[PDB]
């Protein structure tokens, strides 16, 4: 069984993002980068790239050199490969949708990489999920713009960006028996791409569906998991550590008013062993008490340990938080 | 290891309670009895004794012979011993509090047993918990009657009613390190009395800091002493007002309130749709299997141990939903391992 604990990461000042949900973070080395956010329900905040340095445990704002983002986003996501971070999707309150961009942590420069919602290209999106490997950025699910006269729909497909080629290609469509989902767990584990739970169309509902896509065979497997298996949920913090997909919190039941209310949130964590398909429940020690969902999340290494880094989110009071927590894995 | 599944028990008509929460149920033989309820938040409904017959799967109203209840109650609870069921506590919208009464399923008659909130006698109460064994009805925790005479407070103690003696006595006070709680799990397991989680009073006066508890203790009649226990396994986060029952060595729980509402019992708070079982011998929790499980989170259900279609398990009725609506769902977790 997995062994680890929660640690509340002190924030000792500087120019920080403050409380927000629905944003994207990712870690490069000793630094955490944060982009996007929602404070007032369904209202954006800003388009600064915030940087948290773990050594000083303080916040600053990165220099917006190059093709800096033009839209203040909610529902945007972010991943890191090498020294670059990549943001995909998100929208502002006026329904300007962001595109596909990279920021280089060394040169502090932004590059516009792909315009979304073009013909034969990946659609613009909110509340998708992102994963990556050494040469790919992956995008799963989400809620389309989109469009323009097909109503906003969810996606059941994966879009693969080959970094060296600078090209997108859609991976094979899993088909009619797979839920189009937003707010899903999504991760690369030991060469396969896992989709875990989410919010599905088909009265729209939390899903407990688990699948992987296998690049070697170019095909999808629907998986039956066991153990301390969490009830269906979405918009949960999640990250890969080894063979484990670790999740925490999330929405267990949707709000009667969409994203305006808090719905029903969770304060519990779980870990899926992708080798055995067994779930186990994370320990309570150090865990944040107040249920949350819509946090930002990323795999990170802090003070020597791998684990799940979680920031912000909304609370059952519908308030946002600026809590930064780390589940450190032994 | 524990083996079971949820079954939605069909309800085929008659005069049933409809949707409600915060009521008391208990089973005698092939019948389920239901008293009390809350539909509109903090409003009572009625004072009928409802009876659900598992053979016909239909509802009727028991005739109120003898000293019938006088108060339409929310926050009342019920236990069954032998052929009698017992109701304790509860209050109506106007803060009239019910007392201690039993209904004899053989004679179909109510008997008044104890007037509550008398001097040296057990205090009146809302959202306490009840358990029982062959010669006792036990009452734990709850929220006391509110006067200006100080304020409504919670209890950390157990009150024991000896059935043969017709007498109440408070069991030893576990003391300052045990939380005063309402909505607690409470059960007699193999000769000891277990207290599980609940909603606790904070040391900080005011109420704003009152919180879900994950404390687990038992009282041992053999030593007359309390033991606080550290449980492991797939251990649920702190919660209260969950359905629960004993099967063998297992305390089985389902659903409940994981986080309180800023508007007290007026709003839905944060509810759960997951079940767990505490193995009281090993102190290991396991998560109940999902099969047939009610999807929509709930809390404030009525609950009882029951035997249905040959199997023992947890019977759960009604409760409130995240939409703040009530349900009339009747669910049974049938344990095959029995």
Q: Give yes or no for a contact between A261 and B282, defined as CB atoms under 8 angstroms apart.
A: no
CB A66 within 8 A of CB A79: no
Chain A residue nearest residue B286, CA to CA: A228
Give the residue from B209, B210, B287 with the most A CB atoms within 10 Å of its CB, the best one to mutate: B287
| B237/A317 touch (CB, cutoff 8 Å), yes or no | no
DSSP state at residue A268: E
Residue A11 burial (CB count, 10 A): 15
What torsion, rounded to 10 degrees, do the Cα atoms A152, A153, A157, A160 define?
A: 10
Structure tokens at A266: 């969770």
Residue B215, phi then psi, degrees to nearest 5: -70, 140
Residues of B in contact with A284 (CB under 8 A): 214, 235, 237
The whole-angstrom distance between A204's CA and the closest CA on chain B is 13
Chain A, nearest residue to B269 by Cα: A316
Listed by number, the residues of chain B in 28-57 with a beta carbon closer than 8 Å to a beta carbon of chain A are none
Residue B274, token pair as written in the block? 């997951």
Strand duo A226-227 + A278-281: pairing: parallel
Query: How open is the CA angle B325-B331-B335, to the nearest 5 degrees?
Result: 150
Q: CA A300 to CA A297: how far, in whole Å?
A: 9
| Extended strands (E) in A201-243 | 205-214, 219-222, 226-227, 237-241
Q: Tell me if A228 and B237 make a contact (CB, 8 A cut-off).
A: no
Which of these is catalytic: B101, B125, B154, B239? B154
- Report CB contact under 8 Å: B290, A205: no
CA B246, CA B189: separation in Å to the nearest integer? 7
Can you say whether residue A198 is alpha, beta or left, with left for phi > 0 and alpha for psi between -120 and 50 degrees?
Answer: left
Return d(Cα A174, Cα A178) in angstroms, integer.
Answer: 6
Is A91 a catalytic site residue? yes
Contact B259 A291 (CB under 8 A): yes
The answer to whether the CB atoms of A284 and B258 lie below 8 A apart is no
Sign of CA dihedral B192, B198, B202, B205: negative
Between vectors from CA A306 to CA A304 and to CA A308, what angle results, nearest 5°?
130
What is the DSSP pairing of strand B158-162 with strand B167-170? antiparallel
The position carrying tokens 């057990």 is: B122
Query: Is A12 exposed, middle or buried, given 0-12, 13-18 or 19+ CB atoms closer than 10 A?
Result: exposed
Rounded-to-integer distance, Cα B4 and Cα B221, Å? 31
Residue in A20, A77, A101, A154 annotated catalytic: A154
CA B287 to chain A, closest CA, distance in angstroms equals 6
Asked if B269 lies within 8 A of A228 by C-beta distance, the reply is no
> If we measure between CA atoms, which residue out of B210, B257, B219, B221 comes closest to residue B237?
B257
Question: Given A77, A91, A233, A292, which residue is catalytic?
Answer: A91
User: In a 10 Å sphere around its CB, with 0-12 CB exposed, 13-18 middle and 19+ buried, how is residue A207 labelled?
Assistant: buried
Q: State the smallest CA–CA distance between residue B302 and chain A in angstroms.
A: 21
Give the three-class secondary structure for A234. Answer: strand
Measured CA angle at A313 (ends A59, B256), to 5 deg? 145
Decide if B91 is catalytic: yes
Whether the CB of A317 is below 8 Å from some CB of chain B: the reply is yes
Among B91, B156, B181, B239, the one annotated catalytic:
B91
> From CA B193, how far away is CA A290, in angstroms rounded?
30
**Burial, B106: exposed, middle or buried (Cβ in 10 Å; 0-12, 13-18, 19+)?**
exposed
User: Which residue does chain A place closest to B274, by CA atoms?
Assistant: A231
Instruction: Report the SS3 class of residue B5.
Output: strand
Contact of A274 with chain B, judged by CB distance below 8 Å, is answered with no
Contact A232 B295 (CB under 8 A): yes
Q: Which residues of B176-191 are buried (b: 16+ CB within 10 A; e: fewer)?
A: eebbbbbbbbbbbbee
Using a CB-CB cut-off of 8 Å, the residues of chain B touching A224 are none
| DSSP letters for A5-70 | EEEE-----BS---S-BS-EEEEETTEEEEE--BSSTT-B-----EEEETTTTEEEE---EES---
């Amino acid at each position: 069984t997995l062994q680890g604990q929660w640690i509340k990461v002190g924030q000792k000042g500087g120019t920080g993002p403050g409380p927000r949900s629905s944003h994207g973070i990712a870690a490069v080395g000793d630094k955490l980068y944060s982009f996007g956010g929602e404070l007032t329900p369904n209202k954006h905040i800003d388009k600064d790239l915030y940087v948290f340095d773990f050594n000083t445990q303080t916040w600053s704002i990165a220099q917006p050199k190059g093709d800096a983002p033009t839209v203040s986003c909610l529902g945007v996501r972010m991943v890191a490969v090498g020294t670059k971070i990549y943001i995909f999707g998100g929208r502002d309150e006026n329904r300007n949708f962001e595109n596909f961009r990279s920021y280089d942590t060394v040169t502090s420069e932004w590059t516009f990489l792909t315009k979304l919602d073009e013909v034969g290209g990946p659609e613009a999106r909110t509340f998708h999920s992102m994963a990556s490997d050494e040469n790919h950025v992956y995008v799963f699910g989400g809620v389309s713009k989109g469009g323009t006269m097909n109503t906003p729909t969810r996606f059941r497909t994966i879009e693969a960006y080959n970094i060296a080629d600078g090209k997108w290609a859609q991976l094979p469509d899993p088909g009619d028996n797979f839920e189009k989902r937003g707010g899903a767990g999504f991760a690369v584990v030991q060469g396969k791409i896992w989709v875990v739970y989410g919010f599905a169309t088909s009265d729209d509902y939390e899903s407990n569906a688990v699948q992987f896509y296998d690049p070697a065979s170019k095909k999808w497997t629907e998986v039956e998991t066991t153990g301390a298996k969490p009830s269906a949920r979405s918009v949960f913090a999640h990250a890969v550590v080894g063979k484990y997909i670790i999740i925490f919190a999330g929405e267990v039941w949707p709000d009667l008013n969409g994203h305006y209310g808090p719905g029903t949130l969770s304060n519990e964590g779980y870990a899926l062993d992708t080798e055995t398909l067994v779930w186990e429940k994370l320990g309570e020690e150090g865990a944040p008490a107040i249920p949350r969902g819509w946090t930002a999340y990323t795999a990170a290494t802090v003070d020597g340990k791998n684990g799940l880094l979680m920031h912000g989110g909304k609370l059952p009071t519908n308030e946002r938080t600026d809590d930064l927590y780390f589940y450190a894995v032994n």
